């Protein structure tokens, strides 16, 4: 169903794949961007320690400051997902 494309990453392979699997699970459960984002954020806090932030949407730009090795920006279908730690 949904094409996964990593646009920009400062993040290990395993964590990248986890971010995609996590977003895929979120999208199976939830349709609202904010709820998808909450699920990913909370899972990443739980597995990789706080504090994570997550943005999900079709139309946004951003300028954020992340901890090294804790950043990914990717598409699942037409939905863009920004996940990072600061």
């Amino acid at each position: 169903d949904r094409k996964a494309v990593i646009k920009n990453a400062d993040m290990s392979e395993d964590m990248q794949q986890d971010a995609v699997d996590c977003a895929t699970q979120a999208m199976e459960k939830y349709n609202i961007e904010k709820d998808i984002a909450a699920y990913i954020k909370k899972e990443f806090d739980k597995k990789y320690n706080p504090t994570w932030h997550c943005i999900v949407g079709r139309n946004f730009g951003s300028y954020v400051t992340h901890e090294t090795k804790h950043f990914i920006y990717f598409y699942l279908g037409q939905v863009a997902i920004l996940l990072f730690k600061s």
Binding site: G61, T65, F71
Partner: peptide, 9 residues
């Protein structure tokens, strides 16, 4: 800590 820009197309 590093700075990153993203933009949907």
């Amino acid at each position: 800590q590093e700075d990153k820009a993203t933009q949907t197309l």
